[PDB]
Motif scaffolding. Structure first.
Motif, mmCIF file in Angstrom:
data_model
loop_
_atom_site.group_PDB
_atom_site.id
_atom_site.type_symbol
_atom_site.label_atom_id
_atom_site.label_comp_id
_atom_site.label_asym_id
_atom_site.label_seq_id
_atom_site.Cartn_x
_atom_site.Cartn_y
_atom_site.Cartn_z
ATOM 1 N N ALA A 70 -10.798 -0.928 5.003
ATOM 2 C CA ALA A 70 -10.910 0.514 5.250
ATOM 3 C C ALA A 70 -9.586 1.149 5.650
ATOM 4 C CB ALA A 70 -11.959 0.776 6.340
ATOM 5 N N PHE A 71 -8.804 0.387 6.405
ATOM 6 C CA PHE A 71 -7.528 0.866 6.846
ATOM 7 C C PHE A 71 -6.612 1.085 5.612
ATOM 8 C CE2 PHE A 71 -3.177 0.486 8.256
ATOM 9 C CZ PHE A 71 -3.131 1.080 9.534
ATOM 10 N N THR A 72 -6.507 0.093 4.754
ATOM 11 C CA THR A 72 -5.636 0.246 3.612
ATOM 12 C C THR A 72 -6.173 1.335 2.675
ATOM 13 O OG1 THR A 72 -4.913 -2.011 3.818
ATOM 14 C CG2 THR A 72 -4.713 -0.985 1.571
ATOM 15 N N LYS A 73 -7.491 1.348 2.493
ATOM 16 C CA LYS A 73 -8.111 2.353 1.602
ATOM 17 C C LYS A 73 -7.752 3.790 2.037
ATOM 18 C CE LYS A 73 -12.544 4.461 0.760
ATOM 19 N NZ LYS A 73 -12.915 4.329 -0.647
ATOM 20 N N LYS A 74 -7.853 4.042 3.343
ATOM 21 C CA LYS A 74 -7.548 5.365 3.859
ATOM 22 C C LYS A 74 -6.104 5.700 3.675
ATOM 23 C CE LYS A 74 -7.454 8.059 8.098
ATOM 24 N NZ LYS A 74 -8.099 8.300 9.421
ATOM 25 N N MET A 75 -5.241 4.742 4.010
ATOM 26 C CA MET A 75 -3.834 4.975 3.912
ATOM 27 C C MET A 75 -3.458 5.291 2.444
ATOM 28 S SD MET A 75 -1.110 2.652 5.855
ATOM 29 C CE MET A 75 0.580 3.176 5.874
ATOM 30 N N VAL A 76 -3.974 4.533 1.494
ATOM 31 C CA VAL A 76 -3.518 4.744 0.105
ATOM 32 C C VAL A 76 -4.201 5.948 -0.572
ATOM 33 C CG1 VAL A 76 -2.762 2.352 -0.171
ATOM 34 C CG2 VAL A 76 -5.024 2.983 -1.004
ATOM 35 N N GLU A 77 -5.443 6.196 -0.225
ATOM 36 C CA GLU A 77 -6.201 7.302 -0.834
ATOM 37 C C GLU A 77 -5.742 8.625 -0.249
ATOM 38 O OE1 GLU A 77 -10.475 6.712 -0.498
ATOM 39 O OE2 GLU A 77 -10.510 5.202 -2.068
ATOM 40 N N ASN A 78 -5.306 8.638 1.005
ATOM 41 C CA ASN A 78 -4.863 9.907 1.617
ATOM 42 C C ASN A 78 -3.384 10.270 1.283
ATOM 43 O OD1 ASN A 78 -7.450 9.558 2.890
ATOM 44 N ND2 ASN A 78 -6.651 9.843 4.993
ATOM 45 N N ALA A 79 -2.625 9.322 0.719
ATOM 46 C CA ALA A 79 -1.203 9.528 0.518
ATOM 47 C C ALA A 79 -0.958 10.529 -0.606
ATOM 48 C CB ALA A 79 -0.561 8.196 0.131
ATOM 49 N N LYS A 80 0.010 11.429 -0.414
ATOM 50 C CA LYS A 80 0.456 12.294 -1.503
ATOM 51 C C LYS A 80 1.259 11.442 -2.507
ATOM 52 C CE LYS A 80 2.515 16.702 -2.095
ATOM 53 N NZ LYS A 80 3.188 17.781 -1.311
ATOM 54 N N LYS A 81 1.974 10.454 -1.977
ATOM 55 C CA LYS A 81 2.902 9.670 -2.783
ATOM 56 C C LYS A 81 2.791 8.208 -2.406
ATOM 57 C CE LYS A 81 7.444 9.930 -1.469
ATOM 58 N NZ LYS A 81 8.843 10.414 -1.686
ATOM 59 N N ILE A 82 2.518 7.351 -3.394
ATOM 60 C CA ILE A 82 2.548 5.893 -3.168
ATOM 61 C C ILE A 82 3.865 5.414 -3.800
ATOM 62 C CG2 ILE A 82 1.512 3.639 -3.837
ATOM 63 C CD1 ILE A 82 -0.123 5.129 -1.814
ATOM 64 N N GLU A 83 4.533 4.427 -3.160
ATOM 65 C CA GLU A 83 5.700 3.810 -3.775
ATOM 66 C C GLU A 83 5.574 2.308 -3.575
ATOM 67 O OE1 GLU A 83 8.088 6.467 -1.259
ATOM 68 O OE2 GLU A 83 9.479 6.457 -3.013
ATOM 69 N N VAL A 84 6.142 1.566 -4.512
ATOM 70 C CA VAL A 84 6.255 0.100 -4.381
ATOM 71 C C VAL A 84 7.698 -0.299 -4.296
ATOM 72 C CG1 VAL A 84 4.062 -0.376 -5.443
ATOM 73 C CG2 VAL A 84 6.135 -0.358 -6.900
ATOM 74 N N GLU A 85 7.969 -1.347 -3.506
ATOM 75 C CA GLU A 85 9.339 -1.791 -3.309
ATOM 76 C C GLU A 85 9.299 -3.269 -3.530
ATOM 77 O OE1 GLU A 85 10.764 -2.021 0.782
ATOM 78 O OE2 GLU A 85 12.476 -0.783 0.097
ATOM 79 N N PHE A 86 9.939 -3.750 -4.599
ATOM 80 C CA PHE A 86 9.971 -5.224 -4.797
ATOM 81 C C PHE A 86 11.062 -5.843 -3.941
ATOM 82 C CE2 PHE A 86 6.994 -5.474 -8.144
ATOM 83 C CZ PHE A 86 7.112 -4.268 -8.889
ATOM 84 N N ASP A 87 10.942 -7.143 -3.677
ATOM 85 C CA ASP A 87 11.957 -7.818 -2.902
ATOM 86 C C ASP A 87 12.931 -8.426 -3.900
ATOM 87 O OD1 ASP A 87 13.402 -9.195 -0.854
ATOM 88 O OD2 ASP A 87 11.599 -9.193 0.385
ATOM 89 N N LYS A 88 13.765 -9.356 -3.425
ATOM 90 C CA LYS A 88 14.820 -9.939 -4.267
ATOM 91 C C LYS A 88 14.402 -11.055 -5.168
ATOM 92 C CE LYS A 88 18.562 -8.397 -3.947
ATOM 93 N NZ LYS A 88 19.503 -7.586 -3.106
ATOM 94 N N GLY A 89 13.215 -11.587 -4.935
ATOM 95 C CA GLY A 89 12.744 -12.732 -5.694
ATOM 96 C C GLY A 89 11.622 -12.381 -6.647
ATOM 97 N N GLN A 90 10.606 -13.215 -6.632
ATOM 98 C CA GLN A 90 9.494 -13.123 -7.595
ATOM 99 C C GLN A 90 8.840 -11.778 -7.460
ATOM 100 O OE1 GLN A 90 8.382 -17.191 -8.889
ATOM 101 N NE2 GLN A 90 10.033 -15.737 -9.319
ATOM 102 N N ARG A 91 8.558 -11.129 -8.601
ATOM 103 C CA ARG A 91 7.845 -9.815 -8.580
ATOM 104 C C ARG A 91 6.364 -9.898 -8.946
ATOM 105 N NH1 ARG A 91 11.747 -4.885 -10.367
ATOM 106 N NH2 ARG A 91 13.458 -5.440 -8.901
ATOM 107 N N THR A 92 5.947 -11.017 -9.545
ATOM 108 C CA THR A 92 4.525 -11.249 -9.827
ATOM 109 C C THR A 92 4.155 -12.651 -9.326
ATOM 110 O OG1 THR A 92 5.101 -12.062 -11.975
ATOM 111 C CG2 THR A 92 4.463 -9.788 -11.797
ATOM 112 N N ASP A 93 2.927 -12.837 -8.864
ATOM 113 C CA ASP A 93 2.536 -14.172 -8.463
ATOM 114 C C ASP A 93 1.831 -14.878 -9.591
ATOM 115 O OD1 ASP A 93 -0.165 -13.252 -8.598
ATOM 116 O OD2 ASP A 93 -0.386 -13.186 -6.415
ATOM 117 N N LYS A 94 1.278 -16.059 -9.274
ATOM 118 C CA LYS A 94 0.714 -16.900 -10.326
ATOM 119 C C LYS A 94 -0.582 -16.301 -10.937
ATOM 120 C CE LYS A 94 -1.797 -19.685 -7.111
ATOM 121 N NZ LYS A 94 -1.885 -21.052 -6.471
ATOM 122 N N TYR A 95 -1.134 -15.269 -10.303
ATOM 123 C CA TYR A 95 -2.335 -14.585 -10.782
ATOM 124 C C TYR A 95 -2.009 -13.321 -11.563
ATOM 125 C CZ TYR A 95 -4.520 -17.738 -7.441
ATOM 126 O OH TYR A 95 -4.871 -18.868 -6.822
#
Ligand SMILES: Cc1cn([C@H]2C[C@H](OP(=O)(O)O)[C@@H](COP(=O)(O)O)O2)c(=O)[nH]c1=O
Ligand SMILES: [Ca+2]
Length: 129
Positions: free
Chosen positions: A48-73
């Motif tokens: 519920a916490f994440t749902k509220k935070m992401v659904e209420n946001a005007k703007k979502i952004e993603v920030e990748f790190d320096k290594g792997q950007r996708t996991d094995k799934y």
């Protein structure tokens, strides 16, 4: 690290959501944290916490790190920001995720998140109660 645009397609649980990134649908898994599963204690509260935070946001952004950007799934691995606030950090600060899955070369925000966890634990919040 750089913030990039994404839009919410749908909330999933405390540490994953379906986002559109570069115009394609992807499940994203938050770096460096672990929320309880929905069927576990504090699972529904994390979801519920994440749902509220992401659904209420005007703007979502993603920030990748320096290594792997996708996991094995095929899930995106990123720090997610809702109107500039990091979801990963906010979950940990509220005691609704633990710092976890800290793989070398994808751990830029480790110390930031560990400081939040220490504060959550000091306040005995949620998972730490
Ligand atoms: C967070 C994260 C998880 N994973 C993999 C490790 C775990 O594999 P296993 O599925 O074999 O346990 C799984 C944990 O994700 P979940 O907590 O979403 O289940 O995702 C990564 O490979 N890199 C990461 O950064
Ligand atoms: Ca999890």
């Amino acid at each position: 690290l750089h913030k990039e645009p994404a839009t919410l397609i749908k909330a999933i649980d405390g540490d994953t959501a379906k986002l559109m990134y570069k115009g394609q649908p992807m499940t994203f898994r938050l770096l460096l944290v672990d929320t309880p599963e929905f069927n576990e204690k504090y699972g529904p509260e994390a979801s519920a916490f994440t749902k509220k935070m992401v659904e209420n946001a005007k703007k979502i952004e993603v920030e990748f790190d320096k290594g792997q950007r996708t996991d094995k799934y095929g899930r995106g691995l990123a720090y997610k920001y809702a109107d500039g606030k990091m979801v990963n950090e906010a979950l940990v600060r509220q005691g609704l995720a633990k710092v976890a899955y800290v793989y070398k070369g994808n751990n830029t925000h480790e110390q930031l998140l560990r400081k939040a966890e220490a504060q959550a634990k000091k306040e005995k919040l949620n998972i730490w109660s």
